[PDB]
Amino acid sequence: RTRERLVYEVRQKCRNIEDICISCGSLNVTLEHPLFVGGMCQNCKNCFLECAYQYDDDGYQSYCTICCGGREVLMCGNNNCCRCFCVECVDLLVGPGAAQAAIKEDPWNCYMCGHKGTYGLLRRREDWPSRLQMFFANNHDQEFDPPKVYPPVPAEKRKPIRVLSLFDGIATGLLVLKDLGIQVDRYIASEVCEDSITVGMVRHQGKIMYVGDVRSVTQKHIQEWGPFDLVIGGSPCNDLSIVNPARKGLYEGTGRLFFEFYRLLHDARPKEGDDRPFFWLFENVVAMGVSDKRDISRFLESNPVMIDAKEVSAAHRARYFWGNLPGMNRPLASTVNDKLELQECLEHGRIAKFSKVRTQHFPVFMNEKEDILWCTEMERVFGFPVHYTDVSNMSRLARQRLLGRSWSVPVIRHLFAPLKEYFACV
Amino acid sequence: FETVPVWRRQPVRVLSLFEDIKKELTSLGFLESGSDPGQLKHVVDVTDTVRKDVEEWGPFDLVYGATPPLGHTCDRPPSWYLFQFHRLLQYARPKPGSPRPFFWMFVDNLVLNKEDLDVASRFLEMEPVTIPDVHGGSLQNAVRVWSNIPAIRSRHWALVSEEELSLLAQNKQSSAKWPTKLVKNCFLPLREYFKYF
Numbered sequence A: 001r002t003r004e005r006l007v008y009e010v011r012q013k014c015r016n017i018e019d020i021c022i023s024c025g026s027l028n029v030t031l032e033h034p035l036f037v038g039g040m041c042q043n044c045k046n047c048f049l050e051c052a053y054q055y056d057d058d059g060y061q062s063y064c065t066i067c068c069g070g071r072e073v074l075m076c077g078n079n080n081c082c083r084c085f086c087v088e089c090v091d092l093l094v095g096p097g098a099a100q101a102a103i104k105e106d107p108w109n110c111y112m113c114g115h116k117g118t119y120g121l122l123r124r125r126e127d128w129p130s131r132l133q134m135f136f137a138n139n140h141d142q143e144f145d146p147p148k149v150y151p152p153v154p155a156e157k158r159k160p161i162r163v164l165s166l167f168d169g170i171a172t173g174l175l176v177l178k179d180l181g182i183q184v185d186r187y188i189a190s191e192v193c194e195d196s197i198t199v200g201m202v203r204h205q206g207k208i209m210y211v212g213d214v215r216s217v218t219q220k221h222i223q224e225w226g227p228f229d230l231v232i233g234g235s236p237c238n239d240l241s242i243v244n245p246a247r248k249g250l251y252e253g254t255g256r257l258f259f260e261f262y263r264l265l266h267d268a269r270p271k272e273g274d275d276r277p278f279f280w281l282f283e284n285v286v287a288m289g290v291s292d293k294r295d296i297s298r299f300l301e302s303n304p305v306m307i308d309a310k311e312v313s314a315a316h317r318a319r320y321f322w323g324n325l326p327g328m329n330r331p332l333a334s335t336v337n338d339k340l341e342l343q344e345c346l347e348h349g350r351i352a353k354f355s356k357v358r359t360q361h362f363p364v365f366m367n368e369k370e371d372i373l374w375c376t377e378m379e380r381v382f383g384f385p386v387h388y389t390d391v392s393n394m395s396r397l398a399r400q401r402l403l404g405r406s407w408s409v410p411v412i413r414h415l416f417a418p419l420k421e422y423f424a425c426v
Numbered sequence B: 001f002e003t004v005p006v007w008r009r010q011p012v013r014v015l016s017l018f019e020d021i022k023k024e025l026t027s028l029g030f031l032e033s034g035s036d037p038g039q040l041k042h043v044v045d046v047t048d049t050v051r052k053d054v055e056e057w058g059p060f061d062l063v064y065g066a067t068p069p070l071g072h073t074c075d076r077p078p079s080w081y082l083f084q085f086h087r088l089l090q091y092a093r094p095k096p097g098s099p100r101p102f103f104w105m106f107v108d109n110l111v112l113n114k115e116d117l118d119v120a121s122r123f124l125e126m127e128p129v130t131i132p133d134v135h136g137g138s139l140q141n142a143v144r145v146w147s148n149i150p151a152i153r154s155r156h157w158a159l160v161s162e163e164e165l166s167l168l169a170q171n172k173q174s175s176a177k178w179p180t181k182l183v184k185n186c187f188l189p190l191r192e193y194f195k196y197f
């Protein structure tokens, strides 16, 4: 208990807050903390730089901003910020009961977004943006998707797109494609879960050509299926994300599947001499261990963008996106016809207990009683058409299972947006 | 591939992954001496190896990768060796418009799972040739080889029982020395393209 006693002797004014590290309590101050008044050591600088991206949970960044630790945390309601501050740090540094003073705020803004810069013994630096700007100079230059571009094509002639979908699931890709209003010559997709398959065979009238495992597909299977212009895929996470105790890593269990993509991408991407425009997209969770993400980025030789449905969908969850698509790191464009608030999704006579969802216990109030989110609603929350996923006899839990692991339709619209210029349209 | 006349055979440029066959390739007269400065680029942990690193290491002709010895520690899961090998090997291939003799070999010492072997044989596009060490009519050891080197399927045996193979894996556990003598002879038909000494 070095930290508790050291902060306690900081409060008694027997020691200056500027000579200790406000993160771990070390006296080895190597730098001034960018966000707040106080020192910071080299271990906490590296901790900040690595764990700022290591710790991003789906929908939030999960932090703690201060010690890069923490269990129970207070979550910011500002959608341009999304910082969090643990309860232990607030009770320790600010003062006793200050955490319970912070809570009871339903739209809670953190100490960075707040009007005041001074909370208890905690004091925000007036020059924190540029301090973060210099602090973050030893890192994140190895990431954030340095995209490279293809030359545009004249209208006449411009052919219909040919698309290969690995791990298709619910036909999100063909849907966003048809909605984008571009002709699709061939949509060959590889999916296992029979429910997902049936959804596809119905909601697109059989346009999809279905193949088995990504493992069933041979290098010859690729070129024999004609040349492909676009290869998309979201490999199942499971053993990738850290919220799973049993995670077998990228290399075992369900992680392996990444490489299958990696394989079929390679057996797809055109060789030298081909100036043919060629696009590919690999999506995964942001909850990935840093090791596995490092490896994945190495194998794809590209870096991912962290796109959050928050900006244009009604739910906040963020995913990594690898690829070469135009406007990869482009800022999210929120439409007029997109539903930003949860309330816009619910059926008649139900109200929103929150702004945006997570799945935050029971998001809907009905007849002065808490309730679980509905399917016909959840669809809207993910931007799918209403009753899109109502097909066969499939059980409710199975349906929700399907939407739970799907892509956010408006996000994929944002990705596939600048693609209409390279292919045929209606 | 087409054979290379004697008055044109160069020194062979090799890339030895996770294991080092500098020893065997020198004993086969593929490697001369003095550093070597340099013909065999060996690297044991290529978790941080970019395409540019490989390209910059001079062009390569032979790319060799092996799993750890039978029951040798842990390090990383078996499949890592395979996958990594595959990635770097794509980094090592010559441009389609500039063909040239080019060979590669990945070899396992009974360290891969049944599913891992399936992955190997699917990602390298051939089934493994299994080269046993027998003695007194008994499966002493075994390696399995994936390779494009011209004489490979020329060994592979038969009688080694996949079951008996996976049994021989069980029998030898804690000791572990890499059984290189089994893989040594495979490289022989490579002397048709590179100088001898």
Ligand SMILES: Nc1ncnc2c1ncn2[C@@H]1O[C@H](CSCC[C@H](N)C(=O)O)[C@@H](O)[C@H]1O
Residues within 6 Å of the ligand: A166, A167, A168, A169, A170, A171, A172, A173, A190, A191, A192, A193, A196, A212, A213, A214, A215, A233, A234, A235, A236, A237, A257, A405, A406, A407
């Ligand atoms: N071995 C395998 N081969 C092909 N598909 C698989 C697979 N293992 C799991 N899948 C499928 O891959 C999907 C990963 S979740 C991603 C689905 C997709 N992003 C969507 O829009 O819905 C799951 O739906 C699962 O059914």
Ligand SMILES: [Zn+2]
Residues within 6 Å of the ligand: A021, A022, A023, A024, A025, A026, A040, A041, A042, A043, A044
């Ligand atoms: Zn510190």
Ligand SMILES: [Zn+2]
Residues within 6 Å of the ligand: A064, A065, A066, A067, A068, A069, A070, A085, A086, A088, A089
């Ligand atoms: Zn903290």
Ligand SMILES: [Zn+2]
Residues within 6 Å of the ligand: A076, A077, A078, A081, A082, A083, A109, A110, A111, A112, A113, A114
């Ligand atoms: Zn905030």
